[PDB]
Amino acid sequence: VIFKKISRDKSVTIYLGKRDYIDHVERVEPVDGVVLVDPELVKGKRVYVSLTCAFRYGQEDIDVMGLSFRRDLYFSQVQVFPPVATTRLQESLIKKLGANTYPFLLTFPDYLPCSVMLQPAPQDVGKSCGVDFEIKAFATHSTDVEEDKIPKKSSVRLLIRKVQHAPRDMGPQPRAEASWQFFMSDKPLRLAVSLSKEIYYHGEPIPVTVAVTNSTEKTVKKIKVLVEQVTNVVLYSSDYYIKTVAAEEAQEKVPPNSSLTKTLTLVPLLANNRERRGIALDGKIKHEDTNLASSTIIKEGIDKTVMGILVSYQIKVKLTVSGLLLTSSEVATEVPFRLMHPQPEDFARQN
Template identity: 45%
Template sequence: MVVNYKVFKKVSPNGKLTVYLGKRDFVDHISCVEPIDGVILLDSDYLTGRKVFGQVICSFRYGREEDEVMGLKFQKDLYLCSSQIYPQPEKQDLNLTKLQERLLKKLGPNAFPFTFNIPQNAPASVTIQPGVQDQGEPCGIHYFIKTFVGESEIDRSHRRSTISLAIRKVQFAPSKTGRQPCTVVRKDFMLSPGELELEVVLDKQVYHHGEKVAVNICIRNNSNKTVKKIKTMVQQGVDVMLFQNGQYRSTIASIETEEGCPIQPGSTLQKIMYLTPELGTNKDRRGIALDGQLKKQDTNLASSTLLASSDQKDAFGIVVSYTAKVKLYLGALGGEVSAELPFLLMHPKVRYSTVLCRIA
């Protein structure tokens, strides 16, 4: 079986360096991250007496570029790994992938392989959706591979002999799901007998992007209050770990209904409400978290952030979560009753098969 794979290629401005990558999305499996493996093609005459270095950089922009004045910069760059690609160290032992082997065979003796390993606790790629009038680079966490010609790893690179290729670090939905989310909220009222009970159940814990979220609602009104309206919503929580008060929530899908209302004292109502959290209905909303973007590619709402331990939160620059919330309106004097359930919104795990690659 022969399958054509897309190979990503980028050339330096002076045409002397060319980087080849088989993919630009690298999966975080919680316990480990897929290695970044590629090949660089060099101009031998230009590189006489020179060295080539490669780095993986995680860039965290936490403020608007247009607000940077008097040397203030709302961006932090973290160098996750760095190594010398050419001349290759003598003791270097690389386990080449099939793609690297075929690229080396096709490109000739001036091609050299490289492999970078992203640390386990590095944050996932996230982009904060800018406003309509915002300019410059969007806030969020972005990754790119940088290859350059220099004397050392800390040497200042020159633009004409430097290649910066954007990549993404992504997470997929876990194969093992947890318990079905369920919660019960009971509220009693001062100087009133009985209580109002709200039970909310989701049909599963993990949803894929584009799926409908089924919210099962059961209301048992054993109080003397009247439920006049029901509102169900999906909220996206964004926690920017750099700031002490950097948490906020955005409602990305909601339904408000009076069907079955008013729910009189002593009555019961069971209802299923469907919500679809998607980017299409939130494209103009500033501050919505999106999956990391690559040029000329569409994206979607950011996937939920999976952590091996809650202690790792500080290392993840932006933590994204989702909750389904149901709110009952009891009128001006009765107040409100609400219940929340967290769930995961992610992409399904991609299954790869071992095949022979044909390089065009």
């Protein structure tokens, strides 16, 4: 399946192999495509293709001051026409389309975030924001460069996604486990939480093993296990969101001088969430192929602020503990894990 889009004036048509380009940490899948020009309508002009990654912040509200912010995180441009290595997709598209088809290759660097965006809920303090990736093909004249204008009718833009996949090689995953001792009157309530591994895939079930050892004279009335998505906007405005994307409540008691081990399975999915606002996604709410944002992966030496939006996941265990008799207390603890797409194997989107 090839994805095509044509300029208003039909002088420039762009063809891409895919909408979604894979980041698997080691390297990023480059954007290889072709531009089909109409020789009469290009005439004495030059056609370029650009790859822009930008962070954006702000939304249009009636009677609320317009506030907009944009920061380019990467820009790269190449000339396709007139022509100045190739790939199988290009060679095949050229033969399929004709002699007015010209190839382009734009590469991603290693310091960029992946597709993340966020539209807030009514109770949420800050505004709409996200990281977009735009492939734009456009024609310029030599009096167009002289006035600094690139006519819109001669241009065509595609909003591609950079998608986080797990790296191809990685050693056998350590279990993600922590333990806490909550002394209550100098008798310990011990809580251990353990996951099977550190990295889970979108759709993969997460087996959360909870081990309560109650040496206190109080009763654990209730055990609740959540997958929480933590979002930190780290450009323009320091917005913070924490949202439940999966929840199981065991509801089984742990009486005094007893211990209880239980494994609950959670699956953090956008489908579990009627309310799709306040949560970091990899695309727009309306689109069908939109998932929960993958865990941000900050490379060594890269300042976290250039990622724009930081997305992390954690298992939260809340224990309701009975009073003396009065009302009851609640302790809670977090175990971090990472959520991304599976390891890789060796244009308008559906609503």
